[PDB]
Amino acid sequence: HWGYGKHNGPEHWHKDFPIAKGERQSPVDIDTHTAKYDPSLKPLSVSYDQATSLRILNNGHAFNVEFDDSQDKAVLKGGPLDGTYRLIQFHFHWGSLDGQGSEHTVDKKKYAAELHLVHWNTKYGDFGKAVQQPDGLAVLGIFLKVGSAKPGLQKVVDVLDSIKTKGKSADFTNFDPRGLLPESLDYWTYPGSLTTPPLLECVTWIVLKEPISVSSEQVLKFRKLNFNGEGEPEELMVDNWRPAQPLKNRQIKASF
Numbered sequence: 001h002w003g004y005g006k007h008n009g010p011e012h013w014h015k016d017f018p019i020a021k022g023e024r025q026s027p028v029d030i031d032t033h034t035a036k037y038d039p040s041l042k043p044l045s046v047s048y049d050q051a052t053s054l055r056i057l058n059n060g061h062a063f064n065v066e067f068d069d070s071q072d073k074a075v076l077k078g079g080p081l082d083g084t085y086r087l088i089q090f091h092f093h094w095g096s097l098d099g100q101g102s103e104h105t106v107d108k109k110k111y112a113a114e115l116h117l118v119h120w121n122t123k124y125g126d127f128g129k130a131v132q133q134p135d136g137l138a139v140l141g142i143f144l145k146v147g148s149a150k151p152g153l154q155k156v157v158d159v160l161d162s163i164k165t166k167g168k169s170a171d172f173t174n175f176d177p178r179g180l181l182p183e184s185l186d187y188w189t190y191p192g193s194l195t196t197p198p199l200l201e202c203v204t205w206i207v208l209k210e211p212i213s214v215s216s217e218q219v220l221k222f223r224k225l226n227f228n229g230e231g232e233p234e235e236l237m238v239d240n241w242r243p244a245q246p247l248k249n250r251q252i253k254a255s256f
């Protein structure tokens with residue numbers, strides 16, 4: 001029954017998921033003066049023009065836009081990555097207030113939200129196998145700040161009323177995730193983990209330096225979602241972020 005509450009939130013996860021205290025947990029604080037520029041890094045390749053979204057789901061923890069990953073349609077390559085990683089889903093983490101909500105922090109700065117575009121290494125054939133491998137996943141993380149609206153997010157916002165509560169889903173076809181990306185693909189990268197249970201240490205993190213701007217209205221609609229099931233006492237889906245974890249034996253590399 002893990003969650004983000006006082007009795008089941010991040011500080012409790014290690015009891016069911018002891019890897020929570022592991023050597024390469026995420027998220028982390030990105031200390032920008034200590035991150036090392038790596039000329040080894042090759043440019044990141046985000047090829048999302050053939051993405052096929054399927055559905056959107058409230059899973060009690062966040063909302064998730066799921067894609068058809070049965071062919072090489074939307075993929076991430078280059079950067080720190082070897083090979084091809086297929087987009088399977090994206091989701092967000094966000095706050096109760098504009099001053100918190102991201103998982104990663106930048107020089108301890110918290111953003112209003114963070115977008116995770118989740119990809120799996122096609123060398124492992126499926127996502128479930130990939131999560132058992134140290135190089136199984138690549139998650140592209142993109143910060144959200146509140147300011148101007150992001151037009152490409154609006155189709156997501158407008159379907160949230162149909163998936164208010166835990167377990168609700170809806171058709172969500174022809175959504176183009178390119179509309180969620182900032183101009184710059186300058187990034188930080190480090191080896192880490194899933195930021196929710198099971199907290200598996202399978203992720204190459206790629207966190208973009210440039211945030212996207214979303215409007216207050218757009219994020220306010222995120223905060224009207226519910227963690228609870230239909231006909232249960234309302235618990236607003238807010239502050240579904242894990243705090244920064246110890247960096248331990250890792251170096252964050254910068255592409256710029």
Ligand SMILES: Cc1ccc(-c2cc(C(F)(F)F)nn2-c2ccc(S(N)(=O)=O)cc2)cc1
Nearest residue numbers: 064089116118131139193194195196198200
């Ligand atoms: C809609 C949806 C949501 C989650 C999952 C999923 C499953 C699993 C696992 F490991 F159990 F298989 N993790 N995991 C998952 C994926 C990404 C992250 S994150 N926040 O690090 O990007 C954290 C957990 C799949 C689909």
Ligand SMILES: [Zn+2]
Nearest residue numbers: 091093116195
């Ligand atoms: Zn996430």
